[PDB]
Amino acid sequence: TGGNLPDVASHYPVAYEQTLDGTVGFVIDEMTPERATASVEVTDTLRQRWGLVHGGAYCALADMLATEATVAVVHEKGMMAVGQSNHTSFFRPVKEGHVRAEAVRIHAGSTTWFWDVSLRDDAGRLCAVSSMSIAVRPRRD
Amino acid sequence: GGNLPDVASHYPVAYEQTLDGTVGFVIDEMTPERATASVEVTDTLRQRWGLVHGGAYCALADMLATEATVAVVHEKGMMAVGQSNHTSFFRPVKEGHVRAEAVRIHAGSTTWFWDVSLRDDAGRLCAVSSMSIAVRPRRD
Amino acid sequence: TGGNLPDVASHYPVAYEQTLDGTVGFVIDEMTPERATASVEVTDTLRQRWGLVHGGAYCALADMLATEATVAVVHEKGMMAVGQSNHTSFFRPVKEGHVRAEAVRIHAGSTTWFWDVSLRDDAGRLCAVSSMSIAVRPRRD
Amino acid sequence: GGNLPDVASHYPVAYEQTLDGTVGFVIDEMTPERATASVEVTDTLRQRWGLVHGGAYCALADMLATEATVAVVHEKGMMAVGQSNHTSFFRPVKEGHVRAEAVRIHAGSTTWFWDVSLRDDAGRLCAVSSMSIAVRPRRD
Numbered sequence: 001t002g003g004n005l006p007d008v009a010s011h012y013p014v015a016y017e018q019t020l021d022g023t024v025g026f027v028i029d030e031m032t033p034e035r036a037t038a039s040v041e042v043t044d045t046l047r048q049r050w051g052l053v054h055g056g057a058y059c060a061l062a063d064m065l066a067t068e069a070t071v072a073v074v075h076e077k078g079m080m081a082v083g084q085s086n087h088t089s090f091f092r093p094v095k096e097g098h099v100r101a102e103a104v105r106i107h108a109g110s111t112t113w114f115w116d117v118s119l120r121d122d123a124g125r126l127c128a129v130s131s132m133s134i135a136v137r138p139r140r141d
Numbered sequence: 142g143g144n145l146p147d148v149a150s151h152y153p154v155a156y157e158q159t160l161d162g163t164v165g166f167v168i169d170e171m172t173p174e175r176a177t178a179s180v181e182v183t184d185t186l187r188q189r190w191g192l193v194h195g196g197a198y199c200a201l202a203d204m205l206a207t208e209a210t211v212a213v214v215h216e217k218g219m220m221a222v223g224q225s226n227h228t229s230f231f232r233p234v235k236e237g238h239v240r241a242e243a244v245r246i247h248a249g250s251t252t253w254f255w256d257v258s259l260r261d262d263a264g265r266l267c268a269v270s271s272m273s274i275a276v277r278p279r280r281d
Numbered sequence: 282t283g284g285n286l287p288d289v290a291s292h293y294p295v296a297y298e299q300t301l302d303g304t305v306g307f308v309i310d311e312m313t314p315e316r317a318t319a320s321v322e323v324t325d326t327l328r329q330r331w332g333l334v335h336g337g338a339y340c341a342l343a344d345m346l347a348t349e350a351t352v353a354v355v356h357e358k359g360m361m362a363v364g365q366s367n368h369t370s371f372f373r374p375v376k377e378g379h380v381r382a383e384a385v386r387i388h389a390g391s392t393t394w395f396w397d398v399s400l401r402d403d404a405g406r407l408c409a410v411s412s413m414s415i416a417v418r419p420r421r422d
Numbered sequence: 423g424g425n426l427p428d429v430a431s432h433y434p435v436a437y438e439q440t441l442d443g444t445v446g447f448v449i450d451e452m453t454p455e456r457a458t459a460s461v462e463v464t465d466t467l468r469q470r471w472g473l474v475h476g477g478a479y480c481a482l483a484d485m486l487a488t489e490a491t492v493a494v495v496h497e498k499g500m501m502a503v504g505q506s507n508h509t510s511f512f513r514p515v516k517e518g519h520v521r522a523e524a525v526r527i528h529a530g531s532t533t534w535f536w537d538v539s540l541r542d543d544a545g546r547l548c549a550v551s552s553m554s555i556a557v558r559p560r561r562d
């Protein structure tokens with residue numbers, strides 16, 4: 001897919017280049033049922049006015065990666081998956097380079113999957129983490 | 142200039158090039174205890190399934206709470222930056238606007254905390270964000 | 282009930298005085314479907330070794346009050362309610378007196394209710410807050 | 423003395439009278455990067471429905487993460503205390519033990535952060551706690 005999001009449907013409401021993810025440049029590298037990775041090159045579109053990666057950008061990258069890692073498994077079982085909680089904590093800022101995210105699945109329940117997502121800079125330092133709780137529900141249409 | 146608080150003569154990134162400008166965040170009211178902001182839904186704010194992106198609610202809450210703290214503390218020699226953002230999602234938004242209201246609930250020497258509500262065009266509570274804002278002396 | 286917890290069943294697995302809540306002295310004052318209050322007199326049983334109310338005590342009081350405020354409504358509809366996330370943030374410590382909690386319902390969905398709980402000292406100051414997310418599920422037995 | 427780190431000659435509250443002593447928390451391993459603790463389930467740890475109290479997992483995570491920070495920073499003149507505890511609950515515990523393992527993931531000048539896992543007697547992950555620990559100069 002665009003951004004390499006999992007291809008689980010024949011068509012999507014919004015094309016990759018037009019979504020938030022498309023606009024800021026998020027790209028998924030690996031995806032398996034228990035772990036997924038994605039990254040993004042830092043440009044001003046990712047920053048706040050003070051020149052640092054925007055807090056919302058780490059949240060969004062985590063959210064898309066954990067959500068979609070769940071969608072990759074559950075869609076074909078007739079479920080929808082959507083984030084119900086995103087708790088991101090910020091340890092070190094990023095000014096430039098890339099942000100690289102790794103989502104590790106820690107719980108796969110029938111109604112909720114939980115992913116721990118680490119967000120690292122190009123030196124490998126842990127700049128933020130997000131705890132992503134993803135609701136899983138039967139698709140209604 | 143998204144109407145962000147004018148606290149400095151120069152900013153490293155212009156509004157229109159920032160994430161906030163790209164998606165269209167605009168601050169309406171700002172006081173030390175309460176601030177509001179809003180955005181029109183466009184595809185730039187959406188994920189590929191046509192709903193407002195989880196990260197969009199987080200980014201709105203984050204810029205609002207953070208810059209409402211900057212508004213007070215910058216002229217006191219302090220830098221303010223988000224240290225935790227906990228957003229929870231109750232109802233999706235497909236189109237219209239998202240409107241945020243940040244209510245300051247704690248203002249301590251090193252941390253300010255804001256409860257942010259994110260509502261749709263019908264006034265319904267779609268999400269909430271608990272924003273924890275670190276306050277530290279500006280590094281010369 | 283003991284602690285004035287909502288009386289929704291003819292019998293309970295564990296008596297009030299023997300539970301955590303019983304042991305530390307939590308007591309519910311008001312309960313309605315949208316708001317509930319409870320308090321606790323501070324004694325050493327509530328404190329950590331450094332003499333301050335234990336971080337776990339604020340979490341527990343919030344958790345019981347939001348959970349039970351949900352149970353008060355949903356039990357008689359055949360649902361069980363149990364906390365799925367408790368996010369407590371700590372602003373000011375308490376050394377002695379009481380901790381008073383007020384739970385305000387902010388979302389009542391079919392699977393999740395969400396309560397904002399403020400925890401105040403005897404001077405009325407806001408010492409901690411907890412965001413309580415309560416899963417609601419049909420009872421299995 | 424729940425085996426908490428011995429960093430001071432006197433403590434305001436004895437172990438047995440603290441919340442930790444009343445419910446039975448005991449620290450096993452403690453190093454600067456990783457600590458473990460456990461408790462036997464008894465009714466004192468339970469809510470009236472017979473399951474381990476939500477607050478019990480939070481209190482375990484909180485004392486473990488906090489005191490693993492005290493272990494390092496106290497002798498450096500610093501006080502450490504929890505500023506946020508985010509616990510999420512995946513599976514209940516009716517009886518047996520709860521075992522916690524705190525892994526330090528960030529150690530900054532003013533905040534240390536610990537990922538705490540809470541497991542049952544079968545090793546299953548029952549809950550997790552993200553502990554944010556504020557570190558400040560001790561007030562003389």
Ligand SMILES: CC(C)(COP(=O)(O)OP(=O)(O)OC[C@H]1O[C@@H](n2cnc3c(N)ncnc32)[C@H](O)[C@@H]1OP(=O)(O)O)[C@@H](O)C(=O)NCCC(=O)NCCS
Nearest residue numbers: 109110111112363365416418419473475476511512513514
């Ligand atoms: C919140 C929760 C109900 C959500 O369910 P989930 O994430 O979809 O997880 P699953 O439904 O896949 O099941 C996990 C376990 O939760 C419990 N559970 C789930 N639904 C339940 C229900 N309707 N009634 C009773 N227990 C239930 C069961 O113990 C289940 O184990 P089992 O499948 O061996 O019976 C579940 O995660 C949970 O019970 N969490 C623990 C809550 C807790 O312990 N809070 C602390 C205070 S008691």
Ligand SMILES: CC(C)(COP(=O)(O)OP(=O)(O)OC[C@H]1O[C@@H](n2cnc3c(N)ncnc32)[C@H](O)[C@@H]1OP(=O)(O)O)[C@@H](O)C(=O)NCCC(=O)NCCS
Nearest residue numbers: 249250251252333335336371372373374505556558559561
């Ligand atoms: C986390 C914390 C230290 C961060 O400090 P802050 O947000 O900058 O808050 P302030 O520094 O403005 O001070 C608020 C109160 O915190 C306490 N505090 C702050 N710094 C302190 C320090 N270095 N030593 C002792 N107490 C301190 C004091 O009670 C202070 O009140 P006072 O200034 O009237 O004495 C402070 O919010 C706090 O103590 N939170 C509560 C911690 C808690 O109770 N945890 C649960 C287990 S005890």
Ligand SMILES: CC(C)(COP(=O)(O)OP(=O)(O)OC[C@H]1O[C@@H](n2cnc3c(N)ncnc32)[C@H](O)[C@@H]1OP(=O)(O)O)[C@@H](O)C(=O)NCCC(=O)NCCS
Nearest residue numbers: 082084135137138192194195230231232233390391392393
């Ligand atoms: C997570 C969630 C599914 C849990 O459901 P809940 O707390 O039990 O709330 P309810 O089920 O009572 O319903 C609230 C709304 O959620 C949505 N929803 C719930 N279940 C759904 C499902 N199976 N399929 C699609 N939408 C659903 C619907 O919009 C619903 O409104 P409606 O009842 O008018 O259709 C729901 O809160 C939600 O969708 N949250 C918003 C998620 C979100 O917007 N994330 C941001 C990125 S898109």
Ligand SMILES: CC(C)(COP(=O)(O)OP(=O)(O)OC[C@H]1O[C@@H](n2cnc3c(N)ncnc32)[C@H](O)[C@@H]1OP(=O)(O)O)[C@@H](O)C(=O)NCCC(=O)NCCS
Nearest residue numbers: 052054055090091092093224275277278280530531532533
């Ligand atoms: C929140 C925060 C300031 C708390 O500080 P802390 O936990 O004590 O961390 P430290 O103070 O040990 O410093 C870690 C990095 O934070 C930044 N920082 C800390 N204090 C700072 C200050 N007063 N001014 C500018 N940067 C500061 C520096 O990048 C520091 O790295 P360095 O010491 O190598 O320059 C720090 O963790 C931080 O900056 N977090 C990331 C904030 C973020 O990116 N938010 C998202 C929107 S920009």
